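Deviations from the work plan: none for this task. Representative record:
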Amino acid sequence: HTTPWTNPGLAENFMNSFMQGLSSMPGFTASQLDNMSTIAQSMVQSIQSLAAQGRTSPNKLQALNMAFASSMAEIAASQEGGGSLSTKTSSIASAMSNAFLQTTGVVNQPFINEITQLVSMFAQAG
Amino acid sequence: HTTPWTNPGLAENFMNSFMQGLSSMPGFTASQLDNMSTIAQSMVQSIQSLAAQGRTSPNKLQALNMAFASSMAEIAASQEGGGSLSTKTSSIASAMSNAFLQTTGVVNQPFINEITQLVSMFAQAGMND
């Protein structure tokens, strides 16, 4: 239970840290950041409720972390406004990288790469 | 055109309808389905809670519907057990299709394609380390 994918407290820390970091990065409108913040806070509260019920597990926490990251990639790709897709992509990657450093102290680069591929995948579908 | 991210009620109904249908479909273990149902229930409750506060919008709902569908894909692709990846993918796609039909009355094919693409992506990558 040493990572966001196995420890509910660390999953919550990860998502809060991602947002704190993203808030100082370029490419996003106030509206986009509000939307991302609203979503992060709803997913943090949702992991808190499940943890209270003993209803988190590695499999569910993995899927919830992926849900969080996919929804961020989706806002970036679909929501009109702000800077370039490439600026938004770099900003989400830097925010993810700091969220790892703030939690496990170990960046999961393949996961960051995967989220970067999501942004392009979603942008191209829309 | 009307979608699951048009308003909170449609979003919640789509998610519930997806789970109902998937649970009658092949390729999954009881554990994977329990896990998918738990995440679906948490998402619906999140939406009910944002809705009660007037905090939903089409952009936020579209992001949450993606949060939901990605979760489903992640579980299917990565939690060990059940049938083939090919079976899980078509079961997810048929379940999404029915869920549109029961909710809005209209299948959103680009969304179905996105999610089947996610299943592949997530199977290749994993969530390790």
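Chain B has five helices and no strands.
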